[PDB]
Amino acid sequence: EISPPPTANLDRSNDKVYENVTGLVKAVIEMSSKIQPAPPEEYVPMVKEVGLALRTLLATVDETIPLLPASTHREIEMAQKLLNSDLGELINKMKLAQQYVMTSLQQEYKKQMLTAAHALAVDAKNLLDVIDQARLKMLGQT
Amino acid sequence: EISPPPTANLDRSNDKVYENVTGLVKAVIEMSSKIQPAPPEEYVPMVKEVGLALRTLLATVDETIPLLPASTHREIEMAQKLLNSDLGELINKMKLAQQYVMTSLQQEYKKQMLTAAHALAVDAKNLLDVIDQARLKMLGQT
Ligand SMILES: [Cl-]
Ligand SMILES: [Cl-]
């Protein structure tokens, strides 16, 4: 049920009860979000968090490419494109999942959306590894 | 697919790429845990996080009760018992949800498990408020 925000007449800087209530409410909220299948309308905002994380990573990689050997650029740049490829797929299977909300396809497109997301994480790790090999190659310094 | 942990020959203290890959992988993992319905076997560990959070809160409240007016104790102590009541319910509907994994009751007991968890969060907030009224009453100091 609904209640007003906690009283403003008490200092919370060292309020352990308040911190612990907070902790417990978050653990419950987190537990229910995992146990329950998120409503198709939550897809968009979840996908937005993943997109922001991706461009923050792509911007950073662009700031790193210049500082690396010319011979590593092509492979790195290709790794980046595979990621945008995974994002397009993700975004598109999301919209499809949302399209057929109450049909025999909702679950299948949802699965394909999850597979796209999974690929995006696998390919991010492979990018890190391609970047590390480039960095280590650069250290070819005596 | 499976790959070795990232190279140990590079310092990560200021590695923004590594931090960003990490961020993106977490956002993906978090997204999939929300979109997907967690397997009944994940219930236990999730419920353990909620239980630890509860006793940490109950221990803290026990350390606070003594410092409050004798007239507020009974109501506070009752608030605590309502929480252990919610935990028993939660634990029991979990086990039931796990019992009837592949029957016509799995989903219903799962729902009852979620209702218990929800009550636990609502009652934690009410406890905070009962504790705040006690604190403010204590300040009856001139
Ligand atoms: Cl507050
Ligand atoms: Cl590492």
UniProtKB/Swiss-Prot annotation, chains A, B:
The modification Phosphoserine is found at residue 3. Residues 5-142 are annotated as: Interaction with ARHGEF28. It comes from the Eukaryota. Phosphorylated on tyrosine residues upon activation, e.g. upon integrin signaling. Sumoylated; this enhances autophosphorylation. The modification Phosphotyrosine is found at residue 18. The modification Phosphothreonine is found at residue 7. Detected in B and T-lymphocytes. Isoform 1 and isoform 6 are detected in lung fibroblasts (at protein level). Ubiquitous. Expressed in epithelial cells (at protein level). It is found in: Cell junction, Focal adhesion; Cell membrane; Cytoplasm, Perinuclear region; Cytoplasm, Cell cortex. The Pro-rich regions interact with the SH3 domain of CAS family members, such as BCAR1 and NEDD9, and with the GTPase activating protein ARHGAP26. It is linked to Aberrant PTK2/FAK1 expression may play a role in cancer cell proliferation, migration and invasion, in tumor formation and metastasis. PTK2/FAK1 overexpression is seen in many types of cancer. Interacts (via first Pro-rich region) with CAS family members (via SH3 domain), including BCAR1, BCAR3, and CASS4. Interacts with NEDD9 (via SH3 domain). Interacts with GIT1. Interacts with SORBS1. Interacts with ARHGEF28. Interacts with SHB. Part of a complex composed of THSD1, PTK2/FAK1, TLN1 and VCL. Interacts with PXN and TLN1. Interacts with STAT1. Interacts with DCC. Interacts with WASL. Interacts with ARHGEF7. Interacts with GRB2 and GRB7. Component of a complex that contains at least FER, CTTN and PTK2/FAK1. Interacts with BMX. Interacts with TGFB1I1. Interacts with STEAP4. Belongs to the protein kinase superfamily. Tyr protein kinase family. FAK subfamily. Non-receptor protein-tyrosine kinase that plays an essential role in regulating cell migration, adhesion, spreading, reorganization of the actin cytoskeleton, formation and disassembly of focal adhesions and cell protrusions, cell cycle progression, cell proliferation and apoptosis. Required for early embryonic development and placenta development. Required for embryonic angiogenesis, normal cardiomyocyte migration and proliferation, and normal heart development. This is Focal adhesion kinase 1. The lineage of its organism: Eukaryota, Metazoa, Chordata, Craniata, Vertebrata. The chain holds residues 908 to 1049 of 1052 of the full protein.
